[PDB]
Design an enzyme around this catalytic site. Structure first.
Site, PDB file in Angstrom:
ATOM      1  N   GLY A  17      93.915 103.606  67.992  1.00 51.13           N
ATOM      2  CA  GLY A  17      93.515 102.202  67.975  1.00 51.13           C
ATOM      3  C   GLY A  17      94.232 101.491  69.098  1.00 51.13           C
ATOM      4  O   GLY A  17      94.852 102.156  69.936  1.00 51.13           O
ATOM      5  N   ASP A 126      90.392  93.169  57.802  1.00 48.37           N
ATOM      6  CA  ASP A 126      89.788  94.251  58.611  1.00 48.37           C
ATOM      7  C   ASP A 126      89.164  95.274  57.670  1.00 48.37           C
ATOM      8  O   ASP A 126      89.307  96.480  57.840  1.00 48.37           O
ATOM      9  CB  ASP A 126      90.821  94.887  59.580  1.00 48.37           C
ATOM     10  CG  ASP A 126      90.196  95.619  60.772  1.00 48.37           C
ATOM     11  OD1 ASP A 126      88.954  95.628  60.886  1.00 48.37           O
ATOM     12  OD2 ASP A 126      90.953  96.158  61.591  1.00 48.37           O
TER      13      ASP A 126
HETATM   14  N1  LIG Z   1      97.162 107.494  55.641  1.00 45.93           N
HETATM   15  C1  LIG Z   1      96.316 108.033  56.468  1.00 45.93           C
HETATM   16  O1  LIG Z   1      95.983 109.150  56.411  1.00 45.93           O
HETATM   17  C2  LIG Z   1      95.770 107.127  57.527  1.00 45.93           C
HETATM   18  N2  LIG Z   1      96.019 105.807  57.417  1.00 45.93           N
HETATM   19  N3  LIG Z   1      95.553 104.980  58.335  1.00 45.93           N
HETATM   20  C3  LIG Z   1      94.836 105.401  59.363  1.00 45.93           C
HETATM   21  N4  LIG Z   1      94.351 104.574  60.269  1.00 45.93           N
HETATM   22  C4  LIG Z   1      93.442 104.983  61.275  1.00 45.93           C
HETATM   23  C5  LIG Z   1      93.626 104.136  62.535  1.00 45.93           C
HETATM   24  C6  LIG Z   1      92.730 104.637  63.644  1.00 45.93           C
HETATM   25  C7  LIG Z   1      91.276 104.599  63.181  1.00 45.93           C
HETATM   26  C8  LIG Z   1      91.071 105.347  61.881  1.00 45.93           C
HETATM   27  C9  LIG Z   1      91.985 104.855  60.773  1.00 45.93           C
HETATM   28  N5  LIG Z   1      91.626 103.465  60.432  1.00 45.93           N
HETATM   29  N6  LIG Z   1      94.572 106.703  59.466  1.00 45.93           N
HETATM   30  C10 LIG Z   1      95.028 107.583  58.587  1.00 45.93           C
HETATM   31  N7  LIG Z   1      94.700 108.883  58.703  1.00 45.93           N
HETATM   32  C11 LIG Z   1      93.787 109.436  59.528  1.00 45.93           C
HETATM   33  C12 LIG Z   1      93.300 108.911  60.711  1.00 45.93           C
HETATM   34  C13 LIG Z   1      92.347 109.601  61.478  1.00 45.93           C
HETATM   35  C14 LIG Z   1      91.883 110.884  61.131  1.00 45.93           C
HETATM   36  C15 LIG Z   1      92.401 111.427  59.967  1.00 45.93           C
HETATM   37  C16 LIG Z   1      92.235 112.721  59.192  1.00 45.93           C
HETATM   38  C17 LIG Z   1      93.002 112.592  58.124  1.00 45.93           C
HETATM   39  N8  LIG Z   1      93.621 111.447  58.146  1.00 45.93           N
HETATM   40  C18 LIG Z   1      93.307 110.734  59.203  1.00 45.93           C
END
Ligand SMILES: NC(=O)c1nnc(N[C@@H]2CCCC[C@@H]2N)nc1Nc1cccc2cc[nH]c12
Length: 269
Positions: A17, A126
């Protein structure tokens, strides 16, 4: 505040991001090792990550991603429990066989998390399918609290003064008056529902933000996704009530979703 020596990061970027990247890691707890997802920062970004951490520290609900802690090392890091299946929009794009009953289950879980956030007097700001993370194909959690705000004790909305906004998920009062409330998050939840029943398609395809505002002001709304139950499209339309005062809150939304989910569970058996 976490101990960097107890954190082992994997080099691969899971996602990214404006803030930086998300990486997988492992954190040594009192006894067990816990798999974590870590937001790693690329002035403003640091303060924003610390404020996100400050919000997450206050939340405790089964449908909200848990923050393990923060760590200041090579960069500032926000360590969270890992949601192994990743973002809901990407998951549904890759798994088109997920049933309508399974989608209702997941969005209902998001509504329970949001009911809790509303009761807690936090605004998410968001709420989109990219910010719903899957623990399993049957367990969703809300993440990404970088734009979230703790409402003042004397107000039911946050007034933005300044930005780079997810306009297609924002209610008319957000765009027109810069006022963000739990009812504004209900409007976003309607867009999230549409994304989920559309298997992760982008909302308002091929439209600029200004064209979306113009469409909504004309009383027009996105059409019903293929295979989406009439009752769920009805609920999306109720979330998309123009006048914030007549739009339902999350207690009303969660109750409608809960009752319909039990009806479908009954139809299945
Ligand atoms: N706790 C968590 O796993 C977690 N929390 N927040 C976020 N934020 C990201 C910010 C960037 C955009 C996507 C989301 N909004 N991504 C998390 N995991 C994650 C991201 C991406 C791929 C994978 C595969 C397994 N997990 C993944």
């Amino acid at each position: 505040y976490l101990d960097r020596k107890l954190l082992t990061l994997e080099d691969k970027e899971l996602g990214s991001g404006n803030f930086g990247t998300v990486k997988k890691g492992y954190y040594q707890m009192k006894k067990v090792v816990k798999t974590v997802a870590v937001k790693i920062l690329k002035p403003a970004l640091k303060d924003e990550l610390l404020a996100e951490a400050n919000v997450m520290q206050q939340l405790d609900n089964p449908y909200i991603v848990r923050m393990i802690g923060i760590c200041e090392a090579e960069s500032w890091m926000l360590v969270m429990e890992m949601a192994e299946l990743g973002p809901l929009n990407k998951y549904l794009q890759q798994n088109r066989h997920v049933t309508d009953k399974n989608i209702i289950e997941l969005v209902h879980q998001v509504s329970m998390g949001m009911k809790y956030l509303e009761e807690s007097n936090f605004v998410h700001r968001d709420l989109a399918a990219r910010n719903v993370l899957l623990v399993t194909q049957h367990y969703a959690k809300i993440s990404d609290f970088g734009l979230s705000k703790a409402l003042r004790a004397d107000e039911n909305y946050y007034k933005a003064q300044t930005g780079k906004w997810p306009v297609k998920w924002y209610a008319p009062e957000c765009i027109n008056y810069y006022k963000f409330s739990s009812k504004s998050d209900v409007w976003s939840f309607g867009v999230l529902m549409w994304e989920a029943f559309s298997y992760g398609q982008k909302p308002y395809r091929g439209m600029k933000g200004s064209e979306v505002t113009a469409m909504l002001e004309k009383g027009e709304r996105m059409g019903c996704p293929a295979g989406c139950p009439r009752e769920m499209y009805d609920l999306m339309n109720l979330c998309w009530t123009y006048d914030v005062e007549n739009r339902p809150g999350f207690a009303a939304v969660e109750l409608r979703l809960r009752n319909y989910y039990y009806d479908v569970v009954n139809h299945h058996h």
